[PDB]
Structure formats: structure tokens, C-alpha cells
Design a binder for this molecule. Structure first.
Ligand code: NA
Ligand code: NA
Length: 300
């Protein structure tokens, strides 16, 4: 299956796989089924699919998840599944725990079975807010061990505290210990880069900290247009991800409450925002740099 070796994400056949894709808000948009096909048509090789474990939003049951996985495969996309309900724990009142998310993943094991070539399990989205981010490490390690003890073989993906941006550096500091908690070694870290990452050196230094330590890292979400906290330097994110050959997944296909981060307007793939054009068609973008996973074979 998908696995980690020498700090790289590899397919079962040993070929290096570098994610070039986007996030799609499946759990809030069950009617936008065409999104995956559209995302593939624009060149993506991976989609990160927003699920809910039912803690905060409406649980995506096993049949629905099986269908999402099948749809990813039908569109020759690698599938990163993630539980969104953990977002901002300790600061967002409605947030769920990583243990709750873990019980959800365990409940999905029957539909995840046999899909290790295609599906990566991102335990919980941004699973800690800005309050006491050092508290993130213990439950993260516990969730990893719990899923492995349950028999889950899929490559795991781990999000950071401080709402995924890790600005207190807790994930960066504690990564080795988190990595070692997975007996299989098949674990990826994921940084979300928004307005914290507003200078080239912030981005380069963060990514390089993981690369130089031999730990695998992807940019599981990133933004581009400015917000009230600053202006993410997406140009450097894309260039650095290409230089270091690290995966990236843009946020997001469509349907944000604030549409500034919609890559496509109204789920229409022909109508990309400035942001969508940058990500899909710009330098170091998806059209330029995305290679299909080799597990799918050569098309036609
Ligand atoms: Na986010
Ligand atoms: Na920007």
C-alpha cells in the first residue's frame, strides 16, 4: 500500500508520490458529486475529502465513505479522508476529540479494508486551537497508537495545533516523538499554511525543518488571498513544495461561507476565481506539476 520510506511517500510499487491536489468539502455538499471528476480534469492527482464523525456535523456513514473512496478511484485520484469535527479543540466550543475521531475511523475499517493503495487517513483536521497547544501531543500520540492497535494499515496523516498552522512550533518540536508512536512508520505530517506563513523565510524554514530531520511533510491546506491577519505567500509555498518535492493540497474546491477561498465559483470548473487560476494554471501549479499516481496505470 501507500507507505513512507526515507521521508518520502511511496506507492506499493515503490514509486515516489507527490500530492498535487485540493480539498473538497464533501460532508457539507453531498449534492456536488461531480466535484471529484472536475478536480481530476483540471490535473489534480489527490483530493482531501472533508468528512464528519458526527460530533459537530452530520456523520458520514460507512456506505457514504465507501462511495467516496470508490468515486476517488473512478477518477484516478488518491484520497485523503479527514474528520473535520476536531477543528480548533480547546478554543472552538463545538470541537470533538481525537479519540472520538479514532473511534470513528475504527468503525470505518470494513470499508477502508483493501484500499491502502488509495486512501490515507488524516486523523483529525486542525485538532487543537491556540489555547495550550502543548496539550496536542499526548492525544495525537494516543490516537496513532489506538488506530494501529486496531489493525489499521493505511498511511496516516497528522495535523498540527494552533488551528493547523503550528505557529507555536509544537508539532515541529514533537514530530519525532509522534512519528515514533507509529510502529509501521507510515505516517505523514501536514502543515496548513495561511496568514502565519506570510514571508518566504517562514515557509522555507518550516518545510526544511521537516525535510532536514528526515520526516515526511505535506502542505495539507494552504491559502492565498489575504485575510485580516495577513497575506499568505502562496507563491513561495508552491515554489518551495516543488523544490523540495513535497505534496500540497489547496483549500478549497468550492462552497466556503466566505467565498474568497473558492478555487471554482459555484462548483463550476470552467469558472475559476483568481485563486483557482493561480493554483491550477500558475507557475508551480497543479497543471504544471501534477503527476497521476502510478497505481492507476497508463490511461487508454
Ligand atoms: Na482550515
Ligand atoms: Na497571498
Amino acid at each position: 500500500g501507500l507507505h513512507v520510506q526515507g521521508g518520502r511517500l511511496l506507492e506499493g510499487n515503490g514509486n515516489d508520490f507527490v500530492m498535487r491536489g485540493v480539498n473538497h468539502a464533501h460532508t457539507w455538499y453531498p449534492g456536488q458529486t461531480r466535484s471529484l471528476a472536475d478536480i481530476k480534469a483540471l490535473g489534480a492527482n489527490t483530493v482531501r475529502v472533508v468528512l464528519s464523525d458526527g460530533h459537530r456535523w452530520t456523520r458520514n456513514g460507512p456506505a457514504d465513505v465507501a462511495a467516496v473512496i470508490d468515486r476517488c478511484k473512478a477518477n484516478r485520484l488518491i484520497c485523503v479522508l479527514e474528520v473535520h469535527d476536531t477543528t480548533g479543540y480547546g478554543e472552538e466550543p463545538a470541537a470533538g476529540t481525537l479519540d472520538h475521531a479514532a473511534d470513528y475511523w475504527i468503525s470505518l475499517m470494513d470499508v477502508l479494508a483493501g484500499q491502502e493503495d488509495y486512501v490515507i487517513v488524516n486523523i483529525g483536521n486542525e485538532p487543537w486551537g491556540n489555547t495550550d497547544p502543548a496539550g496536542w501531543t499526548a492525544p495525537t500520540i494516543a490516537a496513532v497508537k489506538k488506530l494501529r492497535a486496531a489493525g489499521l494499515a493505511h498511511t496516516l496523516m497528522i495535523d498540527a495545533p494552533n488551528w493547523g498552522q503550528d505557529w507555536q512550533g509544537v508539532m515541529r518540536a514533537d514530530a519525532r516523538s509522534v512519528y515514533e508512536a507509529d510502529p509501521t512508520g507510515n505516517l505523514l505530517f501536514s502543515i496548513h499554511m495561511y496568514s502565519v506563513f506570510d514571508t518566504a523565510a517562514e515557509i522555507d524554514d518550516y518545510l526544511e525543518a521537516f525535510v532536514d530531520a528526515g520526516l515526511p511533510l505535506v502542505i495539507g491546506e494552504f491559502g492565498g488571498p489575504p485575510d485580516q491577519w495577513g497575506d499568505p505567500d502562496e507563491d513561495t509555498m508552491l515554489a518551495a513544495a516543488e523544490r523540495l518535492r513535497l505534496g500540497y493540497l489547496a483549500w478549497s474546491w468550492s462552497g466556503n461561507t466566505d467565498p474568497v477561498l473558492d478555487l471554482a465559483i459555484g462548483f463550476d470548473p470552467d469558472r475559476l476565481s483568481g485563486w483557482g487560476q493561480r493554483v491550477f494554471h500558475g507557475v508551480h501549479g497543479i497543471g504544471e506539476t501534477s503527476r497521476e499516481a502510478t497505481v492507476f496505470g497508463k490511461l487508454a
